[PDB]
Amino acid sequence: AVASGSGEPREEAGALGPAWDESQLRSYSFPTRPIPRLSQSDPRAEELIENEEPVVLTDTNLVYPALKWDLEYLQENIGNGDFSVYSASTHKFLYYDEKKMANFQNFKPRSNREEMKFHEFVEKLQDIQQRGGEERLYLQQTLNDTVGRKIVMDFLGFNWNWINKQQGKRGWGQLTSNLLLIGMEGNVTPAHYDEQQNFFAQIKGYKRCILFPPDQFECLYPYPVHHPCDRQSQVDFDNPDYERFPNFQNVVGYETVVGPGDVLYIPMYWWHHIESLLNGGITITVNFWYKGAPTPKRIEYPLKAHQKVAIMRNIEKMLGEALGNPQEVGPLLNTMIKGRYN
Amino acid sequence: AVASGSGEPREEAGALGPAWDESQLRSYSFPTRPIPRLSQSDPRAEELIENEEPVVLTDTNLVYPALKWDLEYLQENIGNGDFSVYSASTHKFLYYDEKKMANFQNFKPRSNREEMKFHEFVEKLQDIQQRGGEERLYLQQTLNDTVGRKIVMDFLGFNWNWINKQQGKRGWGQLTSNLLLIGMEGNVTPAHYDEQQNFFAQIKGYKRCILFPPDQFECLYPYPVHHPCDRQSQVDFDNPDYERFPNFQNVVGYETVVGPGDVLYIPMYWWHHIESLLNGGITITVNFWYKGAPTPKRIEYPLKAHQKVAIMRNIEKMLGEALGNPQEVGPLLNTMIKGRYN
Ligand SMILES: O=C(O)c1ccc(O)c2ncccc12
Ligand SMILES: O=C(O)c1ccc(O)c2ncccc12
Numbered sequence: 001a002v003a004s005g006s007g008e009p010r011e012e013a014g015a016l017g018p019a020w021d022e023s024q025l026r027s028y029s030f031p032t033r034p035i036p037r038l039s040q041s042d043p044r045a046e047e048l049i050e051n052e053e054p055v056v057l058t059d060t061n062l063v064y065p066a067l068k069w070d071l072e073y074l075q076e077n078i079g080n081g082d083f084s085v086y087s088a089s090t091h092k093f094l095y096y097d098e099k100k101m102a103n104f105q106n107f108k109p110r111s112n113r114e115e116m117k118f119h120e121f122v123e124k125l126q127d128i129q130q131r132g133g134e135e136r137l138y139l140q141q142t143l144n145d146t147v148g149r150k151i152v153m154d155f156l157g158f159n160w161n162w163i164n165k166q167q168g169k170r171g172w173g174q175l176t177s178n179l180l181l182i183g184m185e186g187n188v189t190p191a192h193y194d195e196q197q198n199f200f201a202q203i204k205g206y207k208r209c210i211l212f213p214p215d216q217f218e219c220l221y222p223y224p225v226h227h228p229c230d231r232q233s234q235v236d237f238d239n240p241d242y243e244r245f246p247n248f249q250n251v252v253g254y255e256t257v258v259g260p261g262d263v264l265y266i267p268m269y270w271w272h273h274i275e276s277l278l279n280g281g282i283t284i285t286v287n288f289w290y291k292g293a294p295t296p297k298r299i300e301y302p303l304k305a306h307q308k309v310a311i312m313r314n315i316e317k318m319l320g321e322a323l324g325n326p327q328e329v330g331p332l333l334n335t336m337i338k339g340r341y342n
Numbered sequence: 343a344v345a346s347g348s349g350e351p352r353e354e355a356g357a358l359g360p361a362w363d364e365s366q367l368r369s370y371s372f373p374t375r376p377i378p379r380l381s382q383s384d385p386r387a388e389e390l391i392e393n394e395e396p397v398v399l400t401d402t403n404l405v406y407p408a409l410k411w412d413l414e415y416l417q418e419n420i421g422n423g424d425f426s427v428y429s430a431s432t433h434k435f436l437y438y439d440e441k442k443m444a445n446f447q448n449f450k451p452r453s454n455r456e457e458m459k460f461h462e463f464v465e466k467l468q469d470i471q472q473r474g475g476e477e478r479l480y481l482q483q484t485l486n487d488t489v490g491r492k493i494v495m496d497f498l499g500f501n502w503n504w505i506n507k508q509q510g511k512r513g514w515g516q517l518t519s520n521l522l523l524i525g526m527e528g529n530v531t532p533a534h535y536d537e538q539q540n541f542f543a544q545i546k547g548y549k550r551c552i553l554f555p556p557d558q559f560e561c562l563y564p565y566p567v568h569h570p571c572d573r574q575s576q577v578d579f580d581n582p583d584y585e586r587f588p589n590f591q592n593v594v595g596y597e598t599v600v601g602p603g604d605v606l607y608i609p610m611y612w613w614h615h616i617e618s619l620l621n622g623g624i625t626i627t628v629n630f631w632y633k634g635a636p637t638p639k640r641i642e643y644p645l646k647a648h649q650k651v652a653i654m655r656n657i658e659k660m661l662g663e664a665l666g667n668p669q670e671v672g673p674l675l676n677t678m679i680k681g682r683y684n
């Protein structure tokens with residue numbers, strides 16, 4: 001019906017069959033509806049981006065030259081720089097902010113970061129394959145000037161004309177970075193929101209992206225701002241604790257499967273959960289992050305949900321600073337509302 | 343024991359008997375301990391005021407010349423100015439901030455203010471006595487320059503030397519006003535806190551003062567800041583709703599009965615409930631309000647409870663302004679803490 005999820009799997013050209021099938025998606029408790037897949041030249045697509053709603057653009061050629069990328073070509077050409085590689089005991093990658101790690105002395109990491117050369121990432125990977133199992137790796141590394149010449153040529157051949165025009169038309173700030181992501185089949189990036197605009201350019205393999213609007217904050221229960229998992233959902237999507245998180249039962253997502261050549265606009269403050277399909281082999285993505293447009297001169301009501309999220313964050317941070325201890329934030333907030341506003 | 347309440351009733355000079363007895367106090371659910379009654383010349387008294395804790399000073403002569411005041415002498419001399427007179431259907435006077443009355447269109451007042459000449463206050467009073475019952479009146483009027491000559495002489499003969507030295511030693515701001523209060527026996531001013539320092543100078547009859555420290559905020563459940571009853575306890579002391587207000591069961595007060603010539607220091611942010619004794623006739627009090635000392639240059643931790651109260655107020659006000667509507671404050675606060683900090 002009007003909940004279709006990712007919709008039917010798309011047919012590859014040349015009668016090559018379905019690129020993926022439903023058996024490759026994980027099972028979750030909530031419904032979803034499709035994110036529209038549109039031509040870059042379609043007015044509707046421009047309309048979505050302007051109104052800060054997700055859209056998959058199928059023909060931008062944004063990273064056309066990178067479509068030839070695989071492990072051998074990258075190992076060959078990407079150079080000798082260090083690469084951040086995250087590892088996990090489970091399919092779920094728990095990212096954490098090392099700087100806030102002191103705020104909760106109690107916190108113990110379930111995801112280790114290791115710096116290593118690209119060829120070492122490739123090896124450890126190969127090792128785990130034949131090994132084999134069960135550790136998972138996810139390379140997540142900003143693209144910098146240490147990259148080899150051929151990678152530089154590829155980068156230069158991205159569709160900067162198109163994306164630069166987007167940046168201009170939306171009044172966004174500057175491109176803050178490109179992130180290279182290379183994951184193992186089954187890898188999951190759990191639901192979280194980012195504060196920057198994102199064009200998610202898919203290169204190799206398929207990723208199922210599940211987005212939730214900023215007005216679903218109440219259903220997704222982010223960690224406290226001072227927590228190392230700031231901006232992530234507390235909810236375990238695999239075993240949701242309806243007692244701690246009752247409104248997760250009301251959550252509705254927007255879902256799509258992106259493949260090579262697709263670009264997903266993930267608007268700032270939109271929650272997103274990203275999974276590399278089961279048994280779909282390695283995945284490669286490059287993200288383009290931009291600072292959002294400056295907040296308007298005179299503020300108009302009613303506020304967007306993302307502005308209320310901003311307010312909440314700011315109150316949290318301010319209490320942390322005023323009280324002199326982030327640990328005291330919750331107890332003051334409780335004192336403030338119990339029998340007064342609840 | 344170490345909960346004594348007001349303690350034994352004091353013996354009037356000349357074998358005139360107990361000025362009051364326990365039967366004249368209302369019954370409440372919580373325990374109390376006595377506020378110390380000390381000489382103004384006693385170092386301990388200076389110590390309490392400095393550390394912002396209540397003390398009754400028994401010999402300041404602060405309002406010595408006003409000790410002759412009664413209704414006839416005041417009617418005769420206080421002049422022709424208008425006087426604010428509050429009226430109530432019950433013994434409890436519900437004060438409300440008329441300016442915030444728009445914030446809650448739902449709110450309907452249970453306490454009317456009426457302006458009238460002093461002689462009219464005296465008459466309406468007399469009327470109710472013979473009438474008689476059941477309306478209650480409470481005259482509460484700032485002392486201004488419209489007062490007759492004799493009242494001016496009395497005012498000038500207050501002990502300004504003593505109180506001016508207090509103001510100086512505590513580094514307080516300026517005297518912002520003197521309030522004249524004349525109540526009917528049984529009148530109650532319900533628990534609330536003020537943001538200024540207060541010397542409560544008793545003149546005629548007896549008032550039982552029950553104070554709670556600022557760290558009992560969690561037990562006293564003030565109204566939302568934007569509510570017309572801002573700074574008052576939501577709890578009905580006569581029928582406390584332990585379901586809405588469970589921590590009221592943990593509340594402990596400091597209690598005293600003040601009579602003619604006594605001065606009670608009520609420190610800023612300290613809750614206080616004030617009742618004119620049952621069957622003790624008319625009561626007269628003058629309050630002296632001062633702005634507290636400026637907040638210290640470099641803030642030190644740990645914070646005093648009154649500073650956390652200030653923080654909470656400020657967060658409440660800020661949300662009201664940011665959201666554009668005070669009605670939205672509670673729902674945002676709930677969204678902020680549910681499943682996150684509780
Ligand atoms: O792994 C991904 O596909 C991904 C996509 C979009 C994001 O905003 C991310 N943020 C942190 C880690 C991974 C991601
Ligand atoms: O009525 C009183 O005795 C009284 C004493 C101290 C206060 O701070 C008050 N504030 C508002 C109304 C009355 C009072």
Ligand SMILES: [Zn+2]
Pocket residue numbers: 192193194
């Ligand atoms: Zn992210």
Ligand SMILES: [Zn+2]
Pocket residue numbers: 534535536
């Ligand atoms: Zn008051």
